[PDB]
Structure formats: C-alpha cells, structure tokens
C-alpha cells in the first residue's frame, strides 16, 4: 500500500530532525523563494 | 477531533471567522463501523460581499460565501454537496434590519492558484434592501422641505425678507439632508438613486429661490411679468415634482 | 529577523509574477495605478539583512469629492451672488442671504 | 505608541561553550530554555510582542 | 412655539416667516437627531407617529399664516377670524392628540 510507504517515508524524514538548526546552518545561506496572492486589500485609513 | 486526520477546509472571502468555545468546544464527532466520519463544528464568520450600490436603496445583491481545502489540491481533496446541502431557519429572528432573505443557490467551481487546481464550493444569499427606513430617514423630509420651498409662492411679493428667508434656509436645510443621506453609503465614487433625488430637490428648492429673485428682479420694470409669474410658479412647481415623482419611481422600480 | 545575509537570502519567486491579485482589487475610495517588488538589505547594529519591498501606488478617486464638498460650496457662493439683484433697500434680506452663505 | 527592537546581553556563564563557531545565531525558539531576564515597562498599558510569522526575537 | 406665532401682527410677516420656518426646520432636526436613538429598522415606531403629528402641526400653522397672508389687505375680516379661529383650534386639537396618543400606548 501507498499509505505505508508515505508513513514510513514521513517516520524516516522526521527521525532525528533538529528544528534549532536550519538547512546548512554553518554552511551557505538558504535561499527562500517568496509568492504573494493578494485577497484584499481593505481599508485605507488616513 | 485533534487525534485524527481532519480537512483543512477554510473560507476563502471571510475577513475573519471563529468557531465557539463556551462552554466547551461547540464540536461533534461521530464515526461508524465502516470507517464514516462525520464532523461538525459552529462558526461565525465575517465574510466580504462586495456591493454595487448603483440603484441604492433599491438595491439587490447575491453575497457568496466560498470555502476550499487550504493545501489539498482537486487531486487530493474533492468537496461535494448533498441533496439537503443548506438549510435556513424561521429566518424571522435574523439581524437583517435593511435587507430582507430572497433565497439561496449553491455552486461549485475549480480554481486555479499559485499553489494548484483547488475545487471550492460557494453559497450565494440573496439579499434585497428593504425600502422603510430610508424612506422615513431622506424622502419623505426631503419632500417635506421641497414643499415648504413651494409655500413661498403664496407669500406677499413685497415682503422681501421674509421670501428670501424661507428660501435660504430650504437650501440649507437641503444641503444637510443631502450629508445626512450620504452619511449611509460608503465613500464611493458613482453616483446612486438617493443622490439623484437629493439632487433633483435641491434643484427645485434652488429653482424656487431663484424664482423669487427674478420676481425681484422685474418688478422695478414689468409689473404684469412677476404678476403672472407668481401664478405660473405655483401652477409648475408641484406639477414638475409630481412628474418627477412618477418618472423616479417607475424607472427605479421597475428595473 | 534573526537570520543574516550569510544565513539566508530573499528573492521573489518568478521575480515580477511573484504577486499575483493586484488588478482585481476593487477600492471604492481608490484605484490602484502601479506596484513594484523590490529586493536589498538592510543594516542594524546587530548586523545587515535581506529585504524584499512589495509596493502600490493608489489614486484617490474625485467624485465622492466633487458631490460631497465642490458642489455645496459652489452652490453656496451662487447663493451669495444671488443678493446682488436684490435692490439696496431691501437690507435685512441681503444681510441674512450674506451672513448665513459666510457662516455655513 | 512606540515600535521598538528591544536589545539585552548578560553573562551566563553555564553557556560557554567550545566548537568550529564563536557565535551561536539561535531562534527565539531556543531563548525558552534558557533564563532571561523579567523586564516590564512600569509605564506601559498593553503592550505586544510581534510573533509573525514567528516570534520576533533572536539569541546569540 | 409654533402656535405662538397666532398671537402676532398680521403686519408681522416677516417675524410669523421666521416663526414658521425655524419651526419646522426645528422639528426636521428633532425628527433626524431621534432617529439615531433607535436602529435602523424598516417600520415607523410610536415615537416616530408622535412626531409625524407634530410635524404637521407645525406645517399646519406655516401655512395658516400663508393663508392669512393671502388675504390680508384684500378681506381683512377673513383673515381676522382665521387667526381667531386658529388660535383656539390648533391648541385644543394638539392637546386632544396628545391625550389619545398617551391613552393609547401607555395601556397596551
Ligand atoms: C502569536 O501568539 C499568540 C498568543 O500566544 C498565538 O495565539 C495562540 O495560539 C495558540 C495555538 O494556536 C492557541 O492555543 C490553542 O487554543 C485552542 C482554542 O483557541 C480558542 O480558545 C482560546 C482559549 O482556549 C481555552 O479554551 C479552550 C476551549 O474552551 C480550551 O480547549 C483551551 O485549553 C483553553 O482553556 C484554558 O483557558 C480557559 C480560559 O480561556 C480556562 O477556562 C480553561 O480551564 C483552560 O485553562 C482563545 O484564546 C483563542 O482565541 C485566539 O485564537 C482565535 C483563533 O481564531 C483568534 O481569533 C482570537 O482572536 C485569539 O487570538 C480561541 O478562541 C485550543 O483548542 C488549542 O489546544 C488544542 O490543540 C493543541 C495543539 O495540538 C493541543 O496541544 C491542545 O492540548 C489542544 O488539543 C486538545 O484539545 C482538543 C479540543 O480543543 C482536542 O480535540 C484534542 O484532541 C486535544 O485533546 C487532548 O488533549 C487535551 C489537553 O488539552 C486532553 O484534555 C484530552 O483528553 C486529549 O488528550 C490551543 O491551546 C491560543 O489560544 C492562542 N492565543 C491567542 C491569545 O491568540 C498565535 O498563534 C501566535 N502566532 C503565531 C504566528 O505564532
Ligand atoms: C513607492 O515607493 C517606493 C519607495 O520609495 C518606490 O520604490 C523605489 O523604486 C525605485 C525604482 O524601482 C528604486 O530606485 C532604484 O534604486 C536602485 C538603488 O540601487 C537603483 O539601482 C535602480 O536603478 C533604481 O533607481 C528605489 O530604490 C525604490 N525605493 C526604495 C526605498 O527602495 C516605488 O517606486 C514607489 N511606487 C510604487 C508604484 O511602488
Ligand atoms: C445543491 O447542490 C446539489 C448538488 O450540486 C444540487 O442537487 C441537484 O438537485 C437537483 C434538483 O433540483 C437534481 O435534479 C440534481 O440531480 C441534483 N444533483 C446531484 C449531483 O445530486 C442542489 O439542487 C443544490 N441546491 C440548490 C442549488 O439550492
């Protein structure tokens, strides 16, 4: 099944995962790609 | 609900929303053998309805409340109303003092967004202006001062400031109707149906003043000119208002 | 926030299309004529740090303005003209034609 | 009204430490573990602590 | 204040003008200002009947001195008795609309 490959990945991803460390924390910067989608944008208050 | 895997459905025009919580979590679960999971929740939500308030206030609109799964694209997460999807109460206890419920349809659509093909489902409420505030509020003082303007036609001629007055303080009186009017509407830019009638009094009230200064005006010279000139005011005025009057309303009304 | 330029690094995905739903923004009190994305860094004493600028540029609209404010102030100073026709004589009406176009 | 960056450094010196970096550059996450000081503003009525997109806060 | 306006000078036409139309503005602004005291609800209230009467009222007196206007220095004595009749009319009928008004609402 699908479902027990997904979950043993998901185990296998998060084993051992230090989250106070981010992706090569001491080599190069990590590069975040950004998007925006504007809903609205609703009150203009002077 | 917080130990099994649970839709992240959201609503997608709602300014804010939130679910209840007094005493406890307003939440029900249930679950049948063959693995059916049926979940509900109360909630409260703001949601934007952008009016066009062109024929205001004859106004009718439809207000959409739109919901899909945050991160679950059409592949993932497909969303599907039943027979009996929406069901309205005795409707008579609701907060809709200016509008009054028509009814109700639902959609559903497939979006396309940054992140995928998401399938959302829309409710749309129709919601038609209720026409007893607004006439007790602006038409019928606007009508009121329009014809305390007419009045002045029956006044002695010779009796300068007392016309005048009378004339002066309908267009002021007008002028504050006309803010007060406004005072409901958001700023937009158009103009709408109240306007046009503020406006069309305020012309005739203006119309009625300026009747007088002509009046004024040509008793130095022609006499017989403001004599009859009294007369044909009184006779045009509250035929004109009346004609408007017909001409406003069976445009605005059947339309 | 936390994170220097030698931690991490901004830029806009797509690099002019990164934003998306500008021109379907309904304003009735404006109307927006332009936006920009930007990208640099900034400095603090604690270090310097990535920016990314997103900006609109929005134009009031007149005519509420116009029927609102323009309109009653033009009428008002018609109203005022109005007492020139009135003979001289006639003092108290021309007084309060003036006095109350001044004070409104 | 005021908007501040709100700037702090003590000595702890059950946090020294000995490794490749001379300067540890940790989220807000981590200032949880660790004592910091209890400052309030005496003046002050209701005041916010920003938090988006995560707690505005940094420890070195 | 606006019955007041019975007891002055048929010459006063000016001063019954001013009466008459600062009256009924007054009652405008009564009428708007207690608007707001309720929510904007579709119907009319008894507050807003209470003042709808006195509303005419007042209109009823600008035009009673319209009318007095009218025929002054043309039937004297038609004017004359509108103002006497008027003075009397107007305070009696104002007083019995009050009394049916408060019999009406504070029994319910
Ligand atoms: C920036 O900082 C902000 C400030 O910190 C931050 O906002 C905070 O975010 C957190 C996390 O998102 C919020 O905490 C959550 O709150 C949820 C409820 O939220 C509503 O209610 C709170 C008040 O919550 C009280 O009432 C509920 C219901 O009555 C209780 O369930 C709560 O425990 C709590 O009760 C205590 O307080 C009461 C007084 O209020 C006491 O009477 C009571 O006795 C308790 O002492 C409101 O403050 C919220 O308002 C805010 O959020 C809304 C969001 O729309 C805003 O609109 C609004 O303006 C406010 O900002 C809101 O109204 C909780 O449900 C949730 O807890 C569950 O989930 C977490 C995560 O998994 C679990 O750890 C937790 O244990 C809970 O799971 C259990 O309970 C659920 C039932 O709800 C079960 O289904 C589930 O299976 C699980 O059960 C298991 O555990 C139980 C133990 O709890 C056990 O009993 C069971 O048997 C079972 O084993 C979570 O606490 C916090 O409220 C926000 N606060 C504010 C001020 O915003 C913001 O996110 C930050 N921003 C960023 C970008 O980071
Ligand atoms: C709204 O205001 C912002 C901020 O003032 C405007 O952003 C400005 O945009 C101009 C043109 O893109 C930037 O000029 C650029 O400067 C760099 C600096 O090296 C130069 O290399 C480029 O050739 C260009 O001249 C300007 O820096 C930028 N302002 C800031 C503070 O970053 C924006 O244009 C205004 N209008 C709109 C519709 O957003
Ligand atoms: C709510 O949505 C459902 C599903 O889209 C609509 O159900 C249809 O109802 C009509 C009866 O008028 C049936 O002829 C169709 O076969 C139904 N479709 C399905 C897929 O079952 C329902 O009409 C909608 N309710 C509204 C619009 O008020």
Sequence with gaps: SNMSLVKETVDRLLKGYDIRLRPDFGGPPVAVGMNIDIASIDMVSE | VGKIWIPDTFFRNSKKADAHWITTPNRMLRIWNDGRVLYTLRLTIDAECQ?????????????????????????????????????????????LYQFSFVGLRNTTE??????????????????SRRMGYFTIQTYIPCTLIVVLSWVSFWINKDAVPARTSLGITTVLTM??????????????????????????????VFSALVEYGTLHYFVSSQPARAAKMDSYARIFFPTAFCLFNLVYWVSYLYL | YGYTTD???????????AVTGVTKIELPQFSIVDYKLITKKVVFSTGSYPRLSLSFK?????????????????????????????????????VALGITTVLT | TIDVFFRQSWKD?????????????????????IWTPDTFFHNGKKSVAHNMTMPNKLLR | ????????????????????????????????SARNSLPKVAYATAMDWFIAVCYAFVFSALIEFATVNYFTKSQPARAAKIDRLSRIAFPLLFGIFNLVYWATYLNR
């Design chain 2, 51 to 95: 009016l066009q308030l062109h024929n205001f206030p004859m106004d009718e609109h439809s207000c959409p409340l739109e919901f899909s799964s945050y991160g679950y694209p059409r592949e993932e997460i497909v969303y599907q109303w039943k027979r009996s999807s929406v069901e309205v109460g005795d409707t008579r206890s609701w907060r």
């Design chain 2, 110 to 127: 497939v979006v396309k967004t940054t992140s995928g093909d998401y399938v959302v489902m829309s409710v749309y409420f129709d919601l």
């Design chain 2, 175 to 204: 002028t504050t109707l006309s803010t007060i009017a406004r005072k409901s509407l958001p700023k937009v830019s158009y103009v709408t149906a109240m306007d046009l009638f503020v406006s069309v009094c305020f012309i005739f």
């Design chain 3, 7 to 17: 931690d991490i690094e901004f830029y806009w995905r797509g690099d002019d299309n």
């Design chain 3, 58 to 94: 929005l134009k009031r609209n007149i005519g509420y303005f116009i029927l609102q404010t323009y309109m009653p102030s033009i009428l008002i100073t018609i109203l005022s003209w109005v007492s020139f026709w009135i003979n001289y004589d006639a003092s108290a009406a021309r």
């Design chain 4, 13 to 33: 010196e059950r946090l020294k430490f000995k490794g490749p970096m001379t300067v540890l550059r940790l989220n807000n996450l981590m200032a949880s573990k």
């Design chain 5, 1 to 32: 204040l606006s019955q007041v306006s019975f007891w002055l000078n048929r010459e006063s036409v000016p001063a019954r003008t001013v009466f008459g139309v600062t009256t009924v503005l007054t009652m405008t602004t009564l009428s708007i």
